[PDB]
Design a protein around this ligand. Sequence first.
Ligand SMILES: Cc1ncc(Cc2csc(CCO)c2C)c(N)n1
Length: 352
Amino acid sequence: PKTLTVGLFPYLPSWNENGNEVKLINLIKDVLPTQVSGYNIEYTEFDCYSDASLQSLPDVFSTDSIFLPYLVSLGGVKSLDESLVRGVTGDLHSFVSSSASVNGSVYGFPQYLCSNFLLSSPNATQQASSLLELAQKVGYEQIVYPDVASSSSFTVFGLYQQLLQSSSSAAVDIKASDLPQSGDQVNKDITQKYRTILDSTVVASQREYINSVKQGKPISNYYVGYSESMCEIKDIIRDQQYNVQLIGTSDKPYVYTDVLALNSNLCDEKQKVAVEVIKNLLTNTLVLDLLGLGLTLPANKNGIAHLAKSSNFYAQLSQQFDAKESEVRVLRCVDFANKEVKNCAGVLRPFL
Ligand SMILES: Cc1ncc(Cc2csc(CCO)c2C)c(N)n1
């Protein structure tokens, strides 16, 4: 009868000790209430990195803000009042709030924060402000960066646009015309800088790096990747005193944000229930504590502060987001999504 379909961001950490796989998204799911305000609540995994899923939105969904402006253009999302979101999330960083803003309007509740952070060892032989700077200072094959070494589509597409584009505001909104279509459109200067980072990257996966740290013999004192990817050594990061920081590939540091948005076809009775479910997701201390176990970052200052009270890891990031608040950029797409990203990455790859 009256059911609320909730689409969750499914790309959360996963623990594994051979055979048995524990997914953090399952832990969070088995904590959220299935009965709210008379409505039945269905939590399912919503893959925003699938064009098919972006074509059929649920009542409420968690999408990467990278597709948000394009998602707004389809009209499938509902505009929200500034006060309504503020009363749920609380204080938001400038880049976080701007990541949910499209055409001077808020289109969802910021849920997750992420970036390619730099995990520096205690024996950090070098310090840097950009990955280009760290590439020159340390040298050939010294930094661990799995997504760059493996040339992941979103990373190949991502870094290229970060090096190329520049903005005064936080939102770096690009169109489909700004994408290389062949090879004569590929900026060689940008591709030259990407190569320097790739040259400074060791040919090693994430699993190989983690196992090295666990065995006490790290393959490198430098690691770049998602905060969630470091969750299997969160104790070692704390004990041995590893360092984390917002580092840009060049100049400005980039950030991913996942945003809980409401469908445009929601009635007034469903809108209040959806907000209630959302307010639970963002403020429930048990949910936040579970996020802390997977080292994934809440988007609001309150969620970050809560986890910063018992984690030095979160403490550094909270200091980082505050110190470089005006410098952080967020890449977004105006009139394209996954297909055009995968295609653009395929064009760029040979020139790397
Ligand atoms: C919380 C969080 N962590 C990481 C990401 C970034 C990501 C995760 S999977 C994926 C697909 C790559 O092919 C990307 C870009 C995100 N959006 N939110």
